[PDB]
Design a binder for this molecule. Structure first.
Ligand code: CHL
Ligand code: CHL
Ligand code: CLA
Ligand code: CLA
Ligand code: CLA
Ligand code: CLA
Ligand code: CLA
Ligand code: CLA
Ligand SMILES: CC1=C[C@H](O)CC(C)(C)[C@H]1/C=C/C(C)=C/C=C/C(C)=C/C=C/C=C(C)/C=C/C=C(C)/C=C/C1=C(C)C[C@H](O)CC1(C)C
Ligand SMILES: CC1=C[C@H](O)CC(C)(C)[C@H]1/C=C/C(C)=C/C=C/C(C)=C/C=C/C=C(C)/C=C/C=C(C)/C=C/C1=C(C)C[C@H](O)CC1(C)C
Lengths: 233, 93, 159, 219, 219
């Protein structure tokens, strides 16, 4: 292990953040050395300024203030649409592990039965759930934009304080890397969520169930079999 | 001598080594011979992978005519990628 | 042809080690930096409880599955967990007497990091630090084996 | 109570984050500083957004009152046919054209294409003359003219006029959100919104929203 | 998160009206600035109110836990007779005096006038020595003594101690409001409050409050 010799501003890592980045097209990269507004210096810049919806420096900032939040929501959204469709296929009762009526289970028999175990939270009210969501989330995202307890609000993109128990947040070149592992995995989570959503619209089966159906017959059980559905006539 | 510090890039990642590896080996791996009765070495155990994916927790039988497909498939897949990576002729050939 | 991967350690071909993508690959280097035995800035007690929690929980298993009480139901778990706690006890004793024998004399002279700067000496390598580490190991290991029993008794499809 | 200034009622109140975006600091009604995406950074586009939001707010307020009045009037002491705003647009097709007030002594519009053509002509005229001015004095202000559209003369005192501006903008925002609610009620339950009002006042918690939550279920 | 200062969590939070009454600005726990009538303008009377509210809060918290515990204990694995706090006061009259824990090997108080006289003597003693001090060191502080009543020693670090003050006051306010709820449930429905808890958990919306709303009807 050798201390990555920083000393400078760049952040090359392997090859990630400089003039020579890894662009999007393998030979048809962005013309004229990539549009002049964005030349590295930050995680997640690859060069899709084709519609050009952000050309002001404040919009370049505010869209990324969206991006990191959106991606972090999608990461937990992905895992929180994956887990119990595995667990119910293994050994665990849930009611319905499919993520359409996961929210409808309150109406079913006695509220939410957790992990199939009648010794747990057992939320019978939807209204109290609404109240705690509105109250606690509005508090938390007020603290995101302002900064309150458990660490003050310094950087709204990355706070990096007593919130992190590991205390990794020290060597800045390794996090020139890891701020990018963030965004790569978060865009994976974005398009996995579009998998969830569009598969949810077209066929209405669980995404795990879509993988099982597909692997049972990859040439027949795929998107093209739904192609004649949704046709006017 | 050999070197003075370990280079932290030794696998020089050329991004079209793997895509040409399995893409240029599997597009000719599913042709269809007289040998299997009209089937491939990529679709005939697609049947198998899905087939014993159906009954999930049961690990498949220890003589079931598809371990051969797994082993003979990877015996070529790994070889074509490991000869693709020596398609770094940037200084040698 | 003007390409080489394998290098001697930090130049210097006359120290008996040579660098390989097994020893000095980046992901391996960062991985073994992040393990608790190499952190040097934390108090040895806490390392002791982390290492103990890990090792007790793994040591409980084979006594459960392969011990002489493995077919009699509902008590195969008890004998295994108890025996594993015994093994952890003996490991704690070994740590204590190792502390009594190793750091019993003067320490070494000097230490530098690989990308040279003069780093100070790890406080785990004194008598007090090692004894504290041993106490942490005992606490962590017994807690780990107790957790192994707990985890057996309440777990969805344990078998 | 200080909208025209740094001490305006900000978008989170005492979670205000008093580091507000510097391209709006008071001096215009409705500036509540809630720019999370920031689609109005450019000043001329911001002016377009002020004009556009004013137009949307006035149109939506007109539509909202038009969605509250006729149902109540036909519920109290009159009859229209379908006073609910769904088939009020189809009242010209049913039997005898669109009779205003539900009375065969009023408008009685038989052909909808005549309404169509005259409506296009009048709307083109009024919107063109809205943009570039025209009658009743040439339009010198695109946001608030100040010419003969205020026949009562309430725009003399400036601070009360600015308070009226802020009330207008807040009412317009509420009207837009409420008409969105009207449209969503048109989609989901497809019944009368004031029928919804009466039914929820009769049933406060037994039929709240989630009996109507398993309707658009894909399968 | 800044109760000791101008940035305290005010009585309306985001509708804070940051023109707070100037006779309290932090520096004391529980100062939430909600003075709509203003019955504590005078500072010595304000001190009396701080002391009085502390006494009320501690007494009410003690009473609230005394209203939660015995019913649950007799519901789980013990028996008391009438564990509900109504006839727990009349358990001395019924058959064999007030047996503690529902066990004829504990207090077994036969005559309530003896409890009465001893209670008056002890309560006069402890309240007098509470006001003017006495045993375990003479009382030098009327609000929080700091003498041998904290045998653990949690009052060393000042800011955590102040946070404990604020938690104590907030808990006391909640206890007072909740015991008011207990009293109103004692009046209206007159049944067990934890019986109420179980019945509302079994019946979330069918028997909510307004089945018990036509009881005290005058005629
Ligand atoms: C501090 C607590 C607090 C919470 C939880 C909210 C809640 C919200 N306010 Mg807000 N407000 C809060 C403080 C205040 N608001 C307002 C006055 C307004 C206005 C005028 C508006 C909001 C809007 C919003 C929304 C902004 C994010 C969004 O678009 O929703 C997205 C999230 C969901 C839809 C999840 C819902 C389930 C959000 C639902 C906007 C809105 O209602 O848009 C929908 C809006 O126009 N608020 C005032 C007085 C100045 C506040 C002071 O406390
Ligand atoms: C026996 C002698 C005795 C003496 C000399 C004192 C003396 C004192 N006590 Mg103490 N107490 C005594 C016994 C007891 N006290 C208390 C409980 C308390 C409390 C809780 C408090 C005091 C306080 C005080 C001080 C002034 C209180 C006052 O003005 O009363 C005048 C009051 C009354 C005569 C009765 C007031 C009743 C009240 C209005 C209840 C209203 C009920 C609600 C509206 C709701 C009712 C039902 C629901 C369902 C709606 C004073 C030093 C107070 C203090 O120190 O403040 C700084 C204080 O907060 N005492 C109990 C427990 C029952 C006692 C039992 O013996
Ligand atoms: C809401 C999420 C969100 C937001 C706010 C942004 C915002 C931004 N991205 Mg980003 N991005 C996103 C999602 C998002 N992106 C996803 C999911 C990916 C993976 C494809 C990327 C990949 C990406 C790269 C690789 C790069 C950017 C860049 C940028 C910046 C300039 C580009 C621009 O004007 O787009 C503005 C974006 C929007 C206004 C969002 C439009 C949303 C509407 C609904 C249209 C989307 C519908 C969709 C196209 C229809 C098909 C859906 C199907 C593909 C699933 C800007 C900061 C450039 C940059 O500066 O790097 C950070 C750049 O090089 N993005
Ligand atoms: C795999 C995705 C991923 C990656 C690589 C990172 C990486 C990083 N995050 Mg991050 N984050 C993520 C997902 C991720 N995050 C998600 C989903 C959220 C929302 C819950 C956040 C919320 C978040 C905050 C609020 C902050 C960071 C910060 C950081 C940086 C320092 C912490 C660190 O090194 O942790 C290393 C990360 C890992 C080893 C990944 C752990 C994966 C777990 C073990 C999987 C199981 C978790 C499951 C939920 C249970 C680093 C660049 C801090 C920062 O940048 O400040 C300087 C900071 O303040 N992140
Ligand atoms: C998702 C990963 C996963 C999981 C959870 C299990 C789980 C299990 N396997 Mg399995 N297995 C896996 C991957 C996995 N296997 C793979 C990749 C192979 C090689 C193709 C096998 C081959 C295998 C065999 C040969 C057997 C199991 C058996 C078992 C069971 C003991 C248990 C249910 C045993 C069993 O119960 O099958 C009868 C058994 O005999 N597995
Ligand atoms: C004279 C010396 C001697 C004695 C008395 C024993 C006695 C025993 N041996 Mg043993 N052994 C010896 C020499 C000896 N060994 C030598 C020299 C070797 C090497 C060749 C071995 C190798 C050996 C193996 C490989 C195994 C044994 C096992 C056993 C146990 C078998 C009893 C039984 O049926 O399991 C019933 C077992 C139990 C009820 C578990 C009891 C566990 C201990 C005794 C209790 C510990 C209490 C607790 C940890 C204290 C709490 C501490 C606190 C901080 C929490 C028994 C305790 C078996 C065993 O225990 O392993 C599972 C076993 O598998 N022996
Ligand atoms: C199309 C209608 C419309 C338009 C153009 C605007 C325009 C504006 N608003 Mg505004 N607003 C509206 C409706 C609208 N508002 C409604 C209905 C509400 C009540 C919920 C608000 C509440 C509001 C607040 C609280 C604030 C503003 C502010 C602003 C200004 C800066 C923000 C911006 O650039 O918006 C650009 C807007 C658009 C480009 C419109 C995009 C519409 C698409 C279809 C997306 C909508 C999807 C939606 C989120 C899904 C749910 C809909 C449901 C909430 C109705 C700008 C003048 C800020 C300001 O400074 O005021 C002057 C401010 O603080 N608005
Ligand atoms: C008798 C009990 C009592 C007393 C003496 C006080 C005393 C005080 N409170 Mg307080 N409070 C109480 C109970 C009490 N509180 C309860 C139960 C709650 C929760 C609802 C609160 C919530 C509360 C807040 C949120 C705030 C105070 C504040 C204050 C201070 C200034 C207000 C004042 O002068 O009060 C004088 C009070 C009286 C003279 C009591 C009169 C009682 C009669 C019987 C009328 C009550 C009728 C009632 C309204 C009907 C419904 C009852 C139901 C709500 C329980 C003062 C130290 C403010 C402060 O700065 O804190 C330090 C502040 O911001 N209180
Ligand atoms: C601000 C912001 C910011 C951030 O950053 C981003 C975002 C969020 C995106 C943004 C937002 C936006 C929004 C929300 C918007 C909305 C709007 C609306 C709602 C409108 C309405 C609007 C509405 C409107 C105009 C309306 C109008 C109406 C009308 C005419 C009506 C008419 C009528 C009537 C009379 C009656 C009859 O019988 C029928 C009808 C036909 C019905
Ligand atoms: C602040 C303000 C301000 C503005 O300006 C004006 C106004 C509004 C007027 C004001 C207000 C006031 C108020 C609200 C008050 C309230 C109070 C309370 C609630 C108290 C309680 C209070 C309460 C309390 C003490 C309580 C106590 C209790 C106790 C001892 C108990 C006992 C018991 C027990 C253990 C159990 C058994 O078995 C029985 C019994 C016997 C039951």
């Amino acid at each position: 292990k050798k201390t990555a010799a920083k000393a400078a501003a760049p952040k090359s890592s392997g090859v990630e953040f400089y003039g020579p980045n890894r662009a999007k097209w393998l030979g048809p990269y962005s013309e004229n050395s990539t549009p002049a507004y964005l030349t590295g210096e930050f995680p997640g810049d690859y060069g899709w300024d084709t519609a050009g919806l952000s050309a002001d420096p404040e919009t370049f900032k505010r869209y990324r203030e969206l991006e990191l939040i959106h991606a972090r929501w999608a990461m937990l959204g992905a895992l929180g649409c994956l887990t119990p469709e595995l667990l119910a296929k293994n050994g665990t009762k849930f009611g319905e592990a499919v993520w359409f009526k996961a929210g409808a289970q309150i109406f079913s028999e006695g509220g939410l039965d957790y992990l199939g175990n009648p010794s747990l939270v057992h939320a019978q009210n939807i209204v109290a759930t609404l109240a705690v969501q509105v109250i606690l989330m509005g508090l938390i995202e007020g603290y995101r934009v302002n900064g309150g307890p458990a660490g003050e609000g310094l950087d709204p993109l990355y706070p990096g304080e007593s919130f992190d128990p590991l205390g990794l947040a020290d060597d800045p070149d390794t996090f020139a890397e890891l701020k990018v592992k963030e965004i790569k995995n978060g865009r994976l989570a974005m398009f996995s969520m579009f998998g969830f959503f569009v598969q949810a619209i077209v066929t209405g089966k669980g995404p795990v169930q879509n993988l099982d159906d597909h692997l049972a017959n990859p040439t027949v059980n795929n998107a093209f079999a739904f192609a004649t559905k949704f046709t006017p006539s | 001598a050999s070197n003075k510090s370990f280079p932290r890039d030794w696998v020089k990642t050329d991004p079209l080594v793997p895509v040409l590896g399995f893409a240029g080996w599997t597009i000719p791996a599913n042709i269809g011979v007289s040998a299997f009765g009209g089937q491939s070495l990529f679709g005939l155990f697609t049947q198998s992978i899905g087939e014993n994916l159906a009954h999930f927790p049961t690990g498949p039988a220890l003589d079931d005519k598809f371990w051969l497909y797994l082993i003979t498939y990877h015996l070529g897949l790994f070889l074509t990628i490991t000869l693709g990576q020596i398609g770094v002729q940037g200084r040698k050939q | 042809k003007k390409a080489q991967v394998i290098s001697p350690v930090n130049g210097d071909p006359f120290v008996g080690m040579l660098e390989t993508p097994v020893t000095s690959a980046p992901i391996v280097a960062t991985y073994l930096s992040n393990l608790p035995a190499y952190r040097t800035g934390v108090a040895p007690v806490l390392r002791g409880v982390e290492i103990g929690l890990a090792h007790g929980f793994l040591l409980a298993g084979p006594f459960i599955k392969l011990g002489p009480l493995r077919n009699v139901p509902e008590t195969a778990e008890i004998a295994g967990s108890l025996s594993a706690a015994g093994l952890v006890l003996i490991l704690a004793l070994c740590l204590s007497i190792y502390g009594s024998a190793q750091f019993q004399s003067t320490p070494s002279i000097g230490v530098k990091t690989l990308s040279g700067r003069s780093v100070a000496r790890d406080p785990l390598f004194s008598a007090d630090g090692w004894s504290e580490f041993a106490a942490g190991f005992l606490v962590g290991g017994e807690a780990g084996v107790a957790w192994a029993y707990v985890c057996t008794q309440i777990l969805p499809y344990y078998s």
